[PDB]
A paper describes a structure:
Nucleoplasmin class of histone chaperones perform histone chaperoning function and participate in various developmental processes in eukaryotes. Nucleoplasmin family members hold a structurally well-conserved N-terminal core domain (NTD) followed by a few acidic tracts with varying numbers of aspartate and glutamate residues. Our structure-function analyses characterized a nucleoplasmin isoform from the human malaria parasite, hereafter termed PfNPM.
The crystal structure of PfNPM NTD was solved at 3.25 Å resolution and belonged to the P3121 space group, wherein an asymmetric unit contained five polypeptide chains. The PfNPM NTD revealed a distinct arrangement resembling a doughnut, composed of five monomers arrayed radially along a 5-fold symmetry axis, typical of a nucleoplasmin. Each monomer features eight β-strands antiparallel to one another, yielding a β-sandwich fold arranged in two sheets: sheet-1 encompasses β1, β3, β6, and β8, while sheet-2 encompasses β2, β4, β5, and β7. This could be due to the presence of acidic residues on loops L2, L4, and L6 of the monomers exposed on the distal face of the pentamer. In contrast, the PfNPM NTD lacks a continuous acidic tract and instead has acidic residues discontinuously distributed in both the L2 and L6 loops. PfNPM lacks the AKDE and GSGP motifs and exists only as a pentamer.
Author numbering:
A (entry chain C): 1 to 19, 21 to 46, 48 to 96
B (entry chain D): 1 to 15, 17 to 18, 21 to 46, 48 to 72, 74 to 96
C (entry chain E): 1 to 19, 22 to 36, 38 to 46, 48 to 96
D (entry chain A): 1 to 45, 48 to 96
E (entry chain B): 1 to 46, 48 to 96
Write the structure that this text describes.
């Protein structure tokens, strides 16, 4: 079960639950970005923690290994430069 | 069961030997054009898996699973070919 | 079961025990202001698990298993910038 | 079963086939005090695909995750600057 | 089951065999406020001596690893190059 969402800045994504109690993040990647600053991908659980940092041309992508419980209503957001981030992974149970 | 295809820029790849396919690397090959190039997956939308650019970053390892969901692979960006490599898998 | 802690410099953290094992998945800086900073675990001996700096490398993935019962310890050493540890919990 | 080979430039490696083991997994590639400063590719041969790109004092090592079928008598070679490459992995069944 | 060792430059390390577990997984190699400025390689022995990674003071101080070593093979780990210690960190695993 493939998972993918494009995380627009100032849009907070709570991942939709197809079927699967958990979600696994495998990749984060920018998309021909315009703003030239760093951007953080964050999960809100509480507390709000940085899972990765992208800064346009220097580092446009990074692998991930993040498990998120969907029943825990985990939240995903960007905070740095105003750029969209492409999340890619797969669904998983418990 | 080894998997490998060279993705020409103006070519969209649909990978079915096994049920799922695991991507292990995308890598350039003596590229000539200098801009960035993205590797993309289409499964209900079109998502970037990685970004490659001559000199800056010519390859990256991958850990992406795709259900053989009639997923599609394409490159976007520089007029450069990209070597996708991985392996097949059941369940 | 998601895990996350912000390890302030000169605060030594023993990870919270959600009802047994913990896997470290990421270490990452956060708009740092101040050189290198190391993330360390003190399992008897004290081992560097990763190295972060302001401009060269602000985050890195991790793949570390830690026993919570073994009272393993986490600390940063070097430049005084906060580090976001992120991972997930696991049993046995 | 540990696997290790030094892939000299312009010498084609077909990994020795252990009886019992059918597949071989590549886990890491790394340079060794290289002399020529150009880039070098590691390749596997249906077709001949670049599995990694290494370069002196720029990117000397990389992790790998390549499974190769031993019965298919697949081939490994480096193609670029005249530098040797250290492949490390393990033998495996199914 | 955590594993960690600091490989001094003059030392060949054979990882301790914790019974119950059979394999050992290397997760990281990382320097520790190094003093010498040359590059240093992390190597595994056996018949051969193979480089798993390369570390240097200012350019690249750590790298992730994903190396499986069978404890049955009593493999050896050493660094060769600049006189710097390298912190190997990982965990034990069964089968």
């Amino acid at each position: 079960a493939f998972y993918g969402k494009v995380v627009k800045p100032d849009e907070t994504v709570v991942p939709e639950v197809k079927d699967y109690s958990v979600i696994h993040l495998s990749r984060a990647c920018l998309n021909n970005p315009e703003h030239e600053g760093k951007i953080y991908v964050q999960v809100e659980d509480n507390g709000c923690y940085n899972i990765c940092c992208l800064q346009k041309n220097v580092c446009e992508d990074t692998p991930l290994d993040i498990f998120l419980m969907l029943d825990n209503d985990v939240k995903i957001k960007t905070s740095g430069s105003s750029n969209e981030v492409h999340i890619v992974g797969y669904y998983e149970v418990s």
